Amino acid sequence: SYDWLNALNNLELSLHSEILTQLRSRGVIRTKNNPVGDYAEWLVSNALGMTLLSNSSAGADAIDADGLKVQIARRVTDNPSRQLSALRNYEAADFDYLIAVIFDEYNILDAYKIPHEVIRDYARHSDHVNAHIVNLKGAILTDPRVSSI
Amino acid sequence: SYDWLNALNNLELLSLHSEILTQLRSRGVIRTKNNPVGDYAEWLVSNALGMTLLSNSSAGADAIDADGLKVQIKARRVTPNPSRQLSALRNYEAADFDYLIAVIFDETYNILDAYKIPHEVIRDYARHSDHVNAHIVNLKGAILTDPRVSS
DNA sequence: CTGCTGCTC
DNA sequence: GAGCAGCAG
Ligand SMILES: [Ca+2]
Ligand SMILES: [Ca+2]
């Protein structure tokens, strides 16, 4: 039962920082960011045997056992949207395939592997943020060029 | 004494996080499923300095004050990552706020630093990132010593 | 297609 | 200074 947290005030509800501390100390998350993103890296890495890369700098986040760079999610439990995080400098082929995963605010729902190419045919560019934007909705979910896990 | 947490596994911990977020949202502390710090800051600044929020956080402003001015609200939790690089002012050239307020937290969501930094003083120390098409500012050194910035 | 928030090396 | 993540309308 999660109804005991009505007793804690706004300051005490400090506990979320503590949970991040625990997850960090367990290896689940590296950064103090949105916990969904690092948990995605964590699950994908351990599952199919991937060495993570702390330097996601304009590049992938992991390498498979065949030496291929992998870019690693979105948690749609209050507003259903599946736009993936921004992709910058994509014209340079900085990854060999991408793994995108949906969580339920944090259980797994969907998960896909997409070559850098399929992205091109499912991406639009925004000058405002200087990034190609993609949404994991509908079409791309049915390209046989994409695989699901 | 948060030693009882170790009894929870990963999925239950993540559930507890999101659930805690849903509490503060139900209390009106936050408006999104993003980082509780930013909306908690926005919540903190307005309900303490008499301001009015704008969920239409698009003009680059996040609230109007008692005097009737636009204010951009940006927060950050530095824990000795001690970098104090603020969020993108993706559009600042249009100048859709009068004075910016940046608030600095520690791990336990406590106020280490807070400044009311005005717009032209933001113009005097800003740098533009070609990568993200946005201006970036840091609050360390010359910015703090500027006579046009207060706490 | 328009926007946001915070965080790391 | 370069980079990063997820999230809202
Ligand atoms: Ca990633
Ligand atoms: Ca803000």
Numbering used by the authors:
A (entry chain A): 8 to 20, 22 to 80, 82 to 86, 88 to 115, 117 to 160
B (entry chain B): 8 to 87, 89 to 159
Sentences from the paper on this structure:
The BisI family of restriction endonucleases is unique in requiring multiple methylated or hydroxymethylated cytosine residues within a short recognition sequence (GCNGC), and in cleaving directly within this sequence, rather than at a distance. We present the crystal structures of NhoI and Eco15I_Ntd (N-terminal catalytic domain of Eco15I) in the absence of DNA and in specific complexes with fully methylated GCNGC containing dsDNA. Both proteins are homodimeric, with each domain involved in target sequence recognition and catalysis. The crystal structures show that the modified cytosine bases are recognized in the context of double-stranded DNA, without base flipping.
We truncated the enzyme to the shortest active form of the catalytic domain (containing 173 amino acids) to increase the quality of crystals and refer to this truncated form as Eco15I_Ntd. Crystals of NhoI and Eco15I_Ntd could be grown in the absence of DNA, and as specific complexes with tetra-methylated G5mCNG5mC DNA with Ca2+ cations replacing the Mg2+ cofactor. In the crystal structures of NhoI and Eco15I_Ntd with DNA, the dimerization and DNA binding modes are very similar. In the co-crystal structures with bound DNA, the channel is closed on top by the hairpins of β-strands β7 and β8. A single Ca2+ ion from the buffer is present in the active sites of NhoI and Eco15I_Ntd in complex with DNA. As expected, this Ca2+ ion is coordinated by the aspartate of PD and the glutamine of QVK. In the co-crystal structures of NhoI and Eco15I_Ntd with DNA, the internal methyl groups (G5mCNGC) interact with the side chains of an (H/R)(V/I/T/M) di-amino acid motif near the C-terminus of the distal enzyme subunit and arginine residue from the proximal subunit. The external methyl groups (GCNG5mC) interact with the proximal enzyme subunit, mostly through main chain contacts. All described interactions of NhoI with the internal methyl groups in DNA are conserved in the Eco15I_Ntd–DNA complex. Here, the relevant residues are His139 and Val140 from the distal subunit and Arg98 from the proximal subunit.
